[PDB]
């Protein structure tokens, strides 16, 4: 049968692989763990453009996963049972492969390309296990790894330190795709890239980025694009203050602050790295030689076909969790609403004066606390996810097939272990696109669920293949277009028209204007 | 108006000089030797290019560097040259800006890969302060392996090939990472070429390897697919060299190590025998063979300027490649087995004699039109067919400017036999405004205007991928209409150039090869 130990060739050399096998198939698949796209960006190519990976003289193993990048541990008592034992360093720009194990140099498959999300702050390729995407839709996934929080993101605004080091990684990766990915059985002229929350804000910026034209056929953005408000920075000038000043430097020139950080150690890079819990993208005149706002928005944007989405819960659980630790949420009521929306209203940066547009938009007349606190999480998923992936399909559904979908499948295996007002929480659709196989787990799942699996990951697969999600024995997953259909993804299919049509109306209309009329009574 | 200026690079600072250019007021800084890739020697002979080392204080950039091993078979051409010596040790490159610029200037940036038949040449050739001065544009001249140090294959791991090609990528990579600081723009790289330049600038076209860091082509007499500067196999370089090289080896492993083991002038005796040498379909700078690539529905070309002469066969390649004046031989007694032996020469079997013959000389008897035909066959069958069905590939995925350039150079007509028109390379003199190692060409006030417009149609295109501007003559963008520029001192366009002969090579002749099968 199919090879222990597959051998694959490499601009760089030779890198031994091996055979993995998943539930329910005679198909197994090949892995090749741990491959470098780029020299390690260590000493003077610390906050440096990623360089070409050196050649090495033997087989390579294949084998191990990579370290994941310098991030902090900001319950995820479980993520470190379903996680290999991973160490972490500077020299983390490599790549995992998942190929089924019939294919060779040639094969021409499609090539899925994932970027693990994590606030560009945390994350790693080996969370994430392709071998179930593989196996069942005969495609090539690649899981990726770039620089995350100060080492990823840190800018001076100026040449010493442009910024955006982690997008760049990105970019060389993807590059190491169109060079490598043939020897492996993947068709360069089929990559699709596809992430969550970050990882979709990273895809939406590939898609709007000059430097990433040509190094892929289609995007999937699933929870996150390029506006997403906290991950996108017009000014570098708060990373670039408080690095300087939290690093002790003497700070006189930029090129003594880039000498005396590359001076820093790992353990120093870590205590200054451990006040970022998130960590935006700089307009850093290179990756984003402008706003992602501006590139989408002119008249010369040309997108790649794209399925973008997003779940109807986003600030359902996870995210109050973890934002939210105190549980204050659940101590809103009609007499506190007004105070709690006046600084939702800053943290959304509106003048407080919002607050009252805010509560009629979305809370009106009701007085009943637990529905008051449903308003207030769907007010949050709104800003943060739903209103920004709208925006973005409509800049690029007049140059590009767009495929919009809401996600509202209630996992099986968490319902019960969440409060019963939780529908399809931010990450629940990742689950079912990879087929409930991750790093040493297979989550449970009934039989509902692995059709509604196999139909996304097939939709996906299919969109690899063909820009179109849509085979015969899916249920139809019509384009976007004036209609503004998106796909109502769940156990039973159905599609609507202009999702949150109202909710669009206001924050994108009605709530700039009335803050317009607030420079008129000043 | 700097005499010395200092400027960063990612491996340490370089010294460069001031230089002023004749009867014009800009001035214009050169960085001449400077290192993209460590030298290629020892374990790094048949190996991809490495990163150049870090050096301490400031690095001269005032003299010229090292050209590539090469053998020379013209003896004014190198009364033409600075004094440079022949090395392994020649992975630089030159850089000429106006004077005015710094670090962040954003200037245009044009990158010059030198012609030879991937066997000769050199970046010190070209001076570039010329179209650097006129207009407002940094220009790279780069070096890369030749011969048997850039282009030897074994077809296998050991070595797979395009050394020379993998040196141009680690000199785009360096101009990406460096160029700023010289005042140039990464974002607006232009790579120009000819002939064998023209092969390189065509071959980063259909690489994955040379993705995004160039925004534009400009192919110069010279495409992907020229006949002898491409291979499917490496059969006959590998075997070619094993055997000269005396190693003898019985696997590539062992002939490695032996050829590593050569020193210079083992190495100059085993290169004398490639006069030209091809690219080998490698799998990973060239993953298939140049045709699929450009065939291929998925061919994602930048917006490209391809072009020849009208004259491509008339003078100096002949004087090179027929040094025994066997063409002024031809007549219509002879015609018939010089067609048949060119006909081998162009990899068609022998049949293919008579319809070269009823294609290009029909009944002609006079043997002065019977040898401008043969010459005109020529020419068509190595540049202008091959520009022809590049442009075609490209044009239906991005914007080709394609031109036809027919003005005799008035310093080399009196010179010359009074048949020839535009010679292959006559369009090089006014691309760098007749200004190359230490000579400036003499030109009339026409020529002058001339240079000027393709200066200036060239920068143009650097800046914006269009060569237009108010002013000069209109260059049509090739569509489906198949227009293209007939550039001469009176400007005009034509359609479908050589529609007939296009005809005849691309479909006629190989229907016919196929009729002799079977
Ligand atoms: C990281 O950031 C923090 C915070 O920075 C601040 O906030 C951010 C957001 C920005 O807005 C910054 O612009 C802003 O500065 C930095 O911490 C601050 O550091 C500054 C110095 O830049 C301090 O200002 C001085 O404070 C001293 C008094 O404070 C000292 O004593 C404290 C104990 O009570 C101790 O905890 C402090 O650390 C501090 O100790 C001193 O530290 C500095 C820096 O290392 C060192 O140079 C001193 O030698 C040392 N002093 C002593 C006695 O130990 C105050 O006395 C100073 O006043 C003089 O200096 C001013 C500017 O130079 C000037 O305007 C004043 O008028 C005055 O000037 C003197 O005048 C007389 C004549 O009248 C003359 O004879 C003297 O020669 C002359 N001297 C000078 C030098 O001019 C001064 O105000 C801030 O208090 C401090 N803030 C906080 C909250 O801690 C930190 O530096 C950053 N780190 C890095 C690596 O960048
Ligand atoms: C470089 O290439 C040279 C040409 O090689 C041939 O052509 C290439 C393209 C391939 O097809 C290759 O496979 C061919 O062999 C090559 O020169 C040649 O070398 C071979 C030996 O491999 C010679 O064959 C033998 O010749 C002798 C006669 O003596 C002469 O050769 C020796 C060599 O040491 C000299 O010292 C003498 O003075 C003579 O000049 C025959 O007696 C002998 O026959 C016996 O051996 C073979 C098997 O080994 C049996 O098949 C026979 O039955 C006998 O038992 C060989 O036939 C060949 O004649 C010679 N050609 C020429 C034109 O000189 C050269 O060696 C290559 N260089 C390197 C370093 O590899
Ligand atoms: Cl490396
Ligand atoms: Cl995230
Ligand atoms: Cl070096
Ligand atoms: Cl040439």
Redesign the interface.
């Known amino acids: 049968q199919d090879s222990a130990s597959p051998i694959r060739?490499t601009?760089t050399g030779?890198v031994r692989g091996s055979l993995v096998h998943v539930k329910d198939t005679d198909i197994a698949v090949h892995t090749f763990l741990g491959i470098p796209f780029a020299?390690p960006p260590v000493g003077?190519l610390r906050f440096a453009?990623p360089?070409?990976p050196?050649?090495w003289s033997g087989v390579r193993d294949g084998t191990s996963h990579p370290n994941m990048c310098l991030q902090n541990d900001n319950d995820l008592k479980m993520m470190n049972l379903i996680l290999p034992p991973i160490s972490m360093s500077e020299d983390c720009l490599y790549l995992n492969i998942y190929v089924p194990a019939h294919a060779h140099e040639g094969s021409n498959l499609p090539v899925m390309v994932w970027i693990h999300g994590g606030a560009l702050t945390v994350g790693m390729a080996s969370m994430y296990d392709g071998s179930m995407l593989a196996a069942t839709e005969d495609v090539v996934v690649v899981a990726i790894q770039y620089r995350l929080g100060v080492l990823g993101f840190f800018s001076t605004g100026d040449?010493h330190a442009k910024g955006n080091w982690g997008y760049l990684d990105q970019?060389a990766a993807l590059?190491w795709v169109?060079?490598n990915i043939?020897?492996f059985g993947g068709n360069?002229?089929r990559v699709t890239i596809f992430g969550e929350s970050a990882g979709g804000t990273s895809v939406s910026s590939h898609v709007v980025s000059?430097?990433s034209?040509?190094?892929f056929?289609g995007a999937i953005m699933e929870s996150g694009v390029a506006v997403l408000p906290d991950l996108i920075s017009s000014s570098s000038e708060m990373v670039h203050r408080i690095v300087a000043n939290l690093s002790g430097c003497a700070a006189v020139n930029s090129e003594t602050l880039m000498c005396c950080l590359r001076g820093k150690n790992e353990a120093e890079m870590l205590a200054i790295n451990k006040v970022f819990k998130i960590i935006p993208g700089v307009v850093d005149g290179?990756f984003l030689?402008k706003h992602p706002q501006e590139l989408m928005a002119s008249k010369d944007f040309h997108p790649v076909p794209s399925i973008i989405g997003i779940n109807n819960d986003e600030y359902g659980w996870i995210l109050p969790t973890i934002m939210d630790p105190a549980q204050k949420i659940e101590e809103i009521t009609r007499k506190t609403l007004p105070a709690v929306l006046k600084s939702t209203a800053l943290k959304m940066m509106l003048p407080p004066e919002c607050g009252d547009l805010l509560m009629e938009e979305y809370m009106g007349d009701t007085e009943d606390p637990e529905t008051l606190q449903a308003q207030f999480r769907e007010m949050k998923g709104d800003f943060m996810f739903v209103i920004p992936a709208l925006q973005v399909a409509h800049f690029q559904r007049s140059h590009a097939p767009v495929y919009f979908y809401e996600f509202q499948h209630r996992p099986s295996f968490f319902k019960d272990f969440r409060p019963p007002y939780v529908k399809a929480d931010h990450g629940d659709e990742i689950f079912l696109v990879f087929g409930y196989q991750f790093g040493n787990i297979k989550l449970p799942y009934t039989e509902e669920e692995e059709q509604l699996s196999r139909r996304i990951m097939k939709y996906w697969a299919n969109f690899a293949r063909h820009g179109n999600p849509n085979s015969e024995g899916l249920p139809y997953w019509p384009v976007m277009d004036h209609d503004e259909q998106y796909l109502q993804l769940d156990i039973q299919p159905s599609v609507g028209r202009a999702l949150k049509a109202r909710r669009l109306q206001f924050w994108t209309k009605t709530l700039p204007q009335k803050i317009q009329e607030l420079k008129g009574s000043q």
């Open positions: 060739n601009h030779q020299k003077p453009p360089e070409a050196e050649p040449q970019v590059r169109q060079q043939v020897h360069p002229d000059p430097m034209q040509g190094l056929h290179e030689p």
